[model samples]
Target: GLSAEQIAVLQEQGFELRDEGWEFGMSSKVLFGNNLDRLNPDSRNTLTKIARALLAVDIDKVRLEGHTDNYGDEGYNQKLSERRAESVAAVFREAGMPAANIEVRGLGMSKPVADNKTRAGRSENRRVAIIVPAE
Candidate 1:
């Protein structure tokens, strides 16, 4: 049998686990950078990978939550958050994760896991998270 630390390493590498939790972000840089209306290819690819993982696990339900930095106007931030969530949801549906099992919402800069006072912190505040429900 594998020792505890060995098992943990395997799990961290997504080898031992049957199901995995994945994350991607939609930041100001991605949204408003050179491209105007869509997610950057790298971010899109990340979402695609997460979608593939969800299908692999046969995930029955998922919640896509969007968050934004505190620098933006509240109303605008809310809409941006919602749009980001929807974009991710669309990708998942396209990748064959059932739409019926997916739900999306926007937090709009309300819950900051890191300090929003600095550039890195504010960037960290913006993200889209996929939560796979417990089996």
Candidate 2:
């Protein structure tokens, strides 16, 4: 759990609190749902803050993993997921996250957080997650 000050810092940095739930692993929710192609100003700032926070904790390594829904062709989905992961890593790198400490991976449609029978569920399947080294 974060201290009060840390929690405040996260809120100010635009980190949204969310339950881990059963399917999605523990993670922070992204501010915007649909705009993976470009980072909005707020999202960019939030990611910068997150990177700084990780560095402050002395984390030497991190992973940026991208996932996508099963709606697209296999090849297209793979490429899209890879691009999304690279895009997120680029944001962190631009914000001063060390390139050597960060790694990127694309999982494509191999993982799903919710049942894909519904549109909303399919949407939930697409996401990028940051994995910080555990202390």
Candidate 3:
């Protein structure tokens, strides 16, 4: 584990630090909408620290799955999801993670953690998850 400040920043960005694994929840500040593999400067900075945290652990691979709400074209959302996941993976790679060590997937609107009818729920549905699998 890293320092308090480091962990706090990670949590503030919706990076869930679990005992079993880690994840960058959908609410993460790393923006990835409008078909851009984008992470803002601050977002990228935060991700670097996250990558460092992962480096301290013994994780061999990272799986990032992208999701979206049921409000758009399924095919478009799928591609968007993939781009989002790739965007996050790009951040990790920039922080020194190997391209070969990351697996990306886009679930699109197929899976929803929350109902998409409500505004908040729809927001929750559009997300990318960094799955650091446990041994």
Candidate 4:
């Protein structure tokens, strides 16, 4: 039999076991560049793949939020974030998740899940997150 690490790797790729627990039905985030709305292939794949992993629900029951760090102008970042959210949603559609089942929001740099002062924090701040509403 394969070692435990080997099994874990297989599980992570196979989605047989999501080692990181889904918080309130939220999955791992999709990261972005300093001021770009374009999504890299892996990031796009992560969004679609993870959203597929997360099930669908009612219109207001599921939501996707996109955000950007404070490195750029606020208005510009907001627009970029909006595009990011739509892009993620588009991929989710491509992945077979119903468009009506998810709501999308672009929260710019206004609401950050991490501090924007340092490099790592700023990196953490740029993201598109998939969330399912909790009762």
On TM-score, the candidate that comes out on top is 3
Question: After aligning candidate 3 to the native by TM-score, how far in Å is the CA of 81 from where it should be?
Answer: 0.5
**What would the TM-scores of all predictions be?**
0.73, 0.72, 0.77, 0.66
State how far residue 81 of model 4 sits from its true place (Å): 0.7
Please rank every candidate by lDDT, starting with the best.
3, 1, 2, 4
Clashing pairs in 3: none
How well is each residue in 21-120 modelled by candidate 4, as lDDT tens digits? 2122222243444436666677777666565545432123346677778998999988877888787778777877777776788888997767888987
lDDT of candidate 3 vs native? 0.74
Stretches of candidate 2 off by over 4 Å are 1-36
Displacement of residue 78 (Cα, Å) in model 2 is 1.2
Q: lDDT by residue for model 3 over 46-92, one digit each (tens)?
A: 66777777765545777888888899789998998888888888888
Better of 3 and 4 by TM-score: 3
Q: Count steric clashes of candidate 3.
A: 0
For candidate 1, the 10 contiguous residues with the lowest summed lDDT are: 15-24
Off by over 4 Å in 4: 1-35, 56-61
Clashes of each: 0, 0, 0, 0
Candidate 4, overall lDDT?
0.61
Q: Cα RMSD to native, each candidate?
A: 5.7, 5.2, 4.2, 7.8
TM-score of 4: 0.66
Sorting all predicted structures by TM-score, with the top scorer first, yields: 3, 1, 2, 4
